[PDB]
C-alpha cells in the first residue's frame, strides 16, 4: 500500500511539493491515519536524527526508540495524541501533545510522568463474564469488573498506568474542569469548561472553553479533560 505525498495529512511537518512523490504510510497501529505520524517521519523530520529513510529505518531497527514503554522496531508505527516517545541511548522523553502551531508536538517531559498516559474514554462494551471493556481515544482497551466500569462514562479521561495496566486516576467530564482541545481549528487551546449546549447527539454537543477571557468553542468530541485548575501531567 502506497501513500502519495499529495494525499498525506496536511499538518505533517514535511514539504508538500519538494521531495519524492511518496510518503511513508503508517501501518494501522494504535491511532488514526489522519491523526497519526509514522515513526520514520518523527526520527527524520521532527527530531532530525536521520538524514535519509534508510538511516531512519536503521535507528528504529536497533530498538533505540521506545513508544509507551514498548520498543517499536517498525518504521511505519503510528504515533498520535498523548503518546510517550522515549529515546533509549539519549534518555530524552517526549509526549506528543496538541500544539497551537504544529498541530501535534513533541514536548519534553520529566521521567516521573513517562509511564503515565492520559486516555479519553471513547466507549465501553460488555464482554464475556459480565465484565466491562473500555475503549480509549487511541483504540486501546481495558477490561474491568461491571461495578467499577459502571461509574466511568464516555468522554471521561482516565490516567492510565502503562507499567501496571491500571487506572491511576479517573477524571469525569463535568462542567468546570480543565480541558485541552485535541482536534479541529481550535487545537492546542487549554481552558476551563464552562458552557455546553447539549444536542441530541452527545458527541456533537457545543462546548466552550475559557482562559480569562479568551473563549473558544468546539464540539464535545474534540476536547479531552486534563483535570481541575492544575493539569495532571505536563502537556504544554
Amino acid at each position: 500500500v502506497h501513500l502519495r505525498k499529495s494525499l498525506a495529512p496536511y499538518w505533517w511537518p514535511i514539504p508538500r511539493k519538494a521531495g519524492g512523490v511518496w510518503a511513508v504510510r503508517p501501518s494501522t497501529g494504535p491511532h488514526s491515519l489522519e491523526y497519526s505520524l509514522p515513526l520514520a517521519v518523527v526520527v527524520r523530520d521532527v527530531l532530525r536524527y536521520a538524514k535519509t529513510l534508510r538511516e531512519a529505518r536503521y535507528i528504529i531497527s536497533r530498538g533505540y526508540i521506545k513508544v509507551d514503554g514498548v520498543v517499536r522496531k517498525d518504521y511505519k508505527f503510528p504515533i498520535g495524541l498523548m503518546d510517550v516517545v522515549e529515546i533509549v541511548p539519549t534518555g530524552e522523553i517526549y509526549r506528543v501533545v496538541p500544539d497551537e502551531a504544529k498541530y501535534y508536538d513533541l514536548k519534553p517531559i520529566p521521567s516521573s510522568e513517562a509511564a503515565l498516559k492520559p486516555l479519553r474514554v471513547e466507549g465501553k462494551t460488555a464482554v464475556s463474564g459480565g465484565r466491562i471493556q473500555l475503549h480509549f481515544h487511541d483504540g486501546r482497551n481495558l477490561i474491568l469488573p461491571p461495578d467499577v466500569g459502571r461509574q466511568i462514562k464516555t468522554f471521561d479521561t482516565v490516567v492510565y498506568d502503562l507499567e501496571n495496566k491500571a487506572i491511576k486516576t479517573h477524571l469525569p467530564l463535568r462542567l468546570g474542569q480543565l480541558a485541552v482541545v485535541t482536534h479541529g481549528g481550535n487545537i492546542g487551546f487549554v481552558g476551563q469548561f464552562f458552557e455546553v449546549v447539549w444536542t441530541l447527539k452527545r458527541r456533537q454537543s457545543v462546548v466552550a472553553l475559557r482562559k480569562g477571557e479568551e473563549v473558544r468553542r468546539t464540539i464535545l468530541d474534540y476536547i479531552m479533560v486534563i483535570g481541575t485548575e492544575a493539569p495532571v501531567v505536563k502537556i504544554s
Binding site: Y49, A50, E55, Y58, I59, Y64, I87, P89, T90
Partner: protein
C-alpha cells in the same frame, strides 16, 4: 587561501557520529579538496582521518566560499555500515572503491540467476 572554521557541530548518539558543519573561505582560489577538508577536521578534532567523512562541499555563487557537511564517526566499523558506499568511495580512497567494486560483482550475480 583556505580559511577553515567549524561553523556548527551536532552530537548524534543514535548513529554514533557528530555531524559537523565547516565554513571554507577561499577568496580568489579554487574549491578546497575534500581530502584537505578531512585533514583539517581530523587535525582539528584530534581524530584519525578514517573516522571523518565529507558528504558534500557546496560552493556559493560569485565568490570563493564553500560549506561542507561532514560526519565524524566514533568507530570505523559502524561508519562503514552507516555511510553509503559512494560516500566511502569518495572519502575512503581505495577501500571504498573496492567495497563499491565488490558490491557490483554481487549485483551481476543474482541478476544472471534471475535470468
Amino acid at each position: 587561501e583556505a580559511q577553515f572554521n567549524i561553523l556548527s557541530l551536532r552530537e548524534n548518539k543514535l548513529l554514533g557520529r557528530k555531524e559537523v558543519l565547516v565554513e571554507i573561505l577561499h577568496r580568489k582560489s579554487s574549491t578546497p579538496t575534500r581530502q584537505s577538508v578531512r585533514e583539517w577536521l581530523a587535525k582539528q578534532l584530534g581524530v584519525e582521518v578514517d573516522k571523518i567523512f565529507v558528504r558534500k562541499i557546496k560552493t556559493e555563487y560569485g565568490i570563493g566560499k564553500s560549506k561542507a557537511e561532514v560526519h565524524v564517526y566514533t568507530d570505523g566499523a559502524l561508519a562503514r555500515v552507516i555511510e553509503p558506499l559512494y560516500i566511502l568511495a569518495r572519502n575512503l580512497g581505495e577501500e571504498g572503491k573496492k567495497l563499491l567494486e565488490e558490491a557490483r560483482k554481487r549485483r551481476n550475480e543474482r541478476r544472471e540467476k534471475r535470468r
